[PDB]
Amino acid sequence: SMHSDLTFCEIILMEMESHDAAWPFLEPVNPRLVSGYRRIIKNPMDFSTMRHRLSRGGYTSSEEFAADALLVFDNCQTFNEDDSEVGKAGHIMRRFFESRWEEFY
Numbered sequence: 099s100m101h102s103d104l105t106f107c108e109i110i111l112m113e114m115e116s117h118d119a120a121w122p123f124l125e126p127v128n129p130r131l132v133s134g135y136r137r138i139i140k141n142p143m144d145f146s147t148m149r150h151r152l153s154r155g156g157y158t159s160s161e162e163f164a165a166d167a168l169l170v171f172d173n174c175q176t177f178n179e180d181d182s183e184v185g186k187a188g189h190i191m192r193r194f195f196e197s198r199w200e201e202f203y
């Protein structure tokens with residue numbers, strides 16, 4: 099399971115999930131609601147997947163955790179127009195994450 103040294107990542111992820119702009123990213127992009135997603139996006143990622151991976155030991159390092167966080171935002175930029183509601187949410191969440199990551203590095 100998660101090593102205590104990564105508790106700061108657990109907290110960042112919890113705070114991301116609670117953010118007003120997090121709604122598009124809480125769970126895997128749902129084919130029932132969004133069509134053609136995996137056609138374009140080779141490596142989907144979302145906050146619930148990260149939460150489970152972190153909590154069960156699937157991130158050995160903060161760098162691996164951060165790479166999945168950035169993948170959420172990179173996928174969002176790939177799939178969505180910048181002026182769409184989801185596109186805007188991705189930019190908000192990237193800024194929020196990078197701010198929190200800056201406090202530590």
Ligand SMILES: C/N=C(\NC)Nc1ccc(N2CCC[C@H]2C(=O)NCc2ccc3[nH]c(-c4cnnn4C)nc3c2)cc1
Nearest residue numbers: 118121122123124126127128131132135173174177178184
């Ligand atoms: C400001 N709204 C909220 N604040 C808390 N909550 C909220 C949630 C759902 C709904 N509705 C209302 C009708 C049904 C549901 C709906 O359409 N859900 C679609 C949905 C859900 C997640 C997504 N994630 C990406 C995505 C990610 N990356 N690319 N995309 C295209 N699309 C998504 C589409 C109404 C309000």
